[PDB]
């Protein structure tokens, strides 16, 4: 049986400040990547995420607090969505779940290696079901898959009760091959079969079109260096390792390019790969 993630997508200030007007086309962008990987077979489910809702917050006082301590960060979001949320699924706007961009450098208790908070297992609580992510350029799409997996009440791929199961996107800190581990595809599909994933059953009615081209056809190697690294940085100056502009200074995440990235004429990254466009 299909199941329907019915998404609202929120952008703080601070994204609306830093995108522009290209904010809601790159919202869509990364939410699309995250829904590709959602398609991947080896989640062993059918899962697709789409937008009902999206919300940009260009007045502060009009949004939650976003902070620094991201679990705080998340409560707030969390008690703030509840009034945009009509209360029947046969709204058309009412969603399944909902998730914040910022910008904000997040942080746990321990550091601020921290990218993206969410409670586990609660993605048909409309009072609890809900991510916040630190945009730190595309790869943010994975962050926004990882944190949607825990809100499916899948584990890090390292605990215990992955061990006789089980690189992957839960992974605690990607094979694009095989994204989902076996014990992911268990653990979401235990969940729906439990009887948990009720909201999820009816089709959307006018969804927001996601974007159907690759990531980096809408974004070049400069742009996603901007993204990451700010506006003043450029592309460094193939595929498998993004080097920014920080004597010659250079820097990265070590992420891949994005797919479909140029690497040349009649070229583009496919999979931390330069390939040809037309394929043989
Ligand atoms: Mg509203
Ligand atoms: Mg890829
Ligand atoms: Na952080
Ligand atoms: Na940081
Ligand atoms: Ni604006
Ligand atoms: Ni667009
Ligand atoms: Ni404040
Ligand atoms: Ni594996
Ligand atoms: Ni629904
Ligand atoms: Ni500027
Ligand atoms: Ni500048
Ligand atoms: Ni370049
Ligand atoms: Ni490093
Ligand atoms: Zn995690």
Redesign the pocket.
Known sequence: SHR???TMLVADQSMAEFHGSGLKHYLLTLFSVAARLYKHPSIRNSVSLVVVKILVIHDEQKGPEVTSNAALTLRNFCNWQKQHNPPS?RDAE???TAILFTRQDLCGSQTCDTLGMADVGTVCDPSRSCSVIEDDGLQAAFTTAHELGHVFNMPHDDAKQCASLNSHMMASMLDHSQPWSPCSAYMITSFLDNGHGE????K?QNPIQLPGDLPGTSYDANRQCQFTFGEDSKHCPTCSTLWCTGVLVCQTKHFPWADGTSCGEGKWCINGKCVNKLVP
Request: glycine share 0%; with cysteine.
């Open positions: 329907y993630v019915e699924d009412h969603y399944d909201c999820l059953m009816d959307p």
